[PDB]
Amino acid sequence: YSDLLSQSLNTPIPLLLRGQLREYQHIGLDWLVTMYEKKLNGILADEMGLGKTIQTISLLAHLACEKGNWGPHLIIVPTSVMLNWEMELKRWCPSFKILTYYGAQKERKLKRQGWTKPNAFHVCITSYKLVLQDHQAFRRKNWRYLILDEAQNIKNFKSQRWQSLLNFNSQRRLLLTGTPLQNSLMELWSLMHFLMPHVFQSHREFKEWFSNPLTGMIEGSQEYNEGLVKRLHKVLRPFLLRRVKVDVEKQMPKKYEHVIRCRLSKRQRCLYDDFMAQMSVINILMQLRKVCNHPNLFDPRPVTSPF
């Protein structure tokens, strides 16, 4: 896939769009639309602020204009951002019939009245707090493009969303997230299997035999720190597009991270020593975190008054 895509990418036109894309957003759109044309799902891992939402909107516009892909498109985004995605779609590409599926039982019942009709809607906007329990109506649907904003909510396959959204009948799948990692390497597997099941058909054990060695590279355990990381990159190369804002919009100021550590007050020292010399490791860690923050979290100093 990597080689034949590089061959394919040895430039499209942003047709049917109100605004204009930036030089890098146009390149990302080109990459992901070539991915589509090659019948491949991908992850747009552009860092926050780069505007992957506008990139996906322009991608949908191009699919509808050039390829005539006007069929139903499902965009699943967190509830706090549904309004944002709707406003973006309306400001950048108002041509699409937008169905903002949200509300209570009756409101959603009404909004689904007649949605089975062709051309009734072009882009459907919903949220995880909703599709999670209304999957019975969305599962049996012929979606063309499945878009998930802030895919980090699908970080793990034990959260009832990964399963709820896995078997969603769709032709193409797109994941938008700025942090596919920094909880574990298994989140990448949860995101990719949802993206390319037949490629990662092997259960989580296969990528666990990839992470466990890789995790040791940071710790004392065997520290190859080479070869296996390049193999992981090769595996992830044709699927995800990653860009950092420090170079795309380098005009931003610099940020410095300073770490300072202090001693523990006697009132903190005594409580910490007591909890240490005490339940479970989790409860002990929680109590210690509570102590490190402030001892009043347990019991403030008692106000005294006559008897």
Binding site: W70, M87, K90, P94, P118
Partner: protein, 43 residues
């Protein structure tokens, strides 16, 4: 049905204008909502 390859690309104009008007009204509502409404008249 199944014959709107171009009819859809022509009718899209009306929906585009409608959504444009709707989003402009949304922006106008937000703008008028952003006001402060402060009046210290010093009786």
């Amino acid at each position: 049905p199944l014959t709107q390859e171009e009819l859809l690309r022509e009718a899209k104009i009306t929906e585009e204008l409608n959504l444009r008007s709707l989003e402009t009204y949304e922006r106008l509502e937000a703008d008028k909502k952003k006001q402060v409404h402060k009046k210290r008249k010093c009786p």
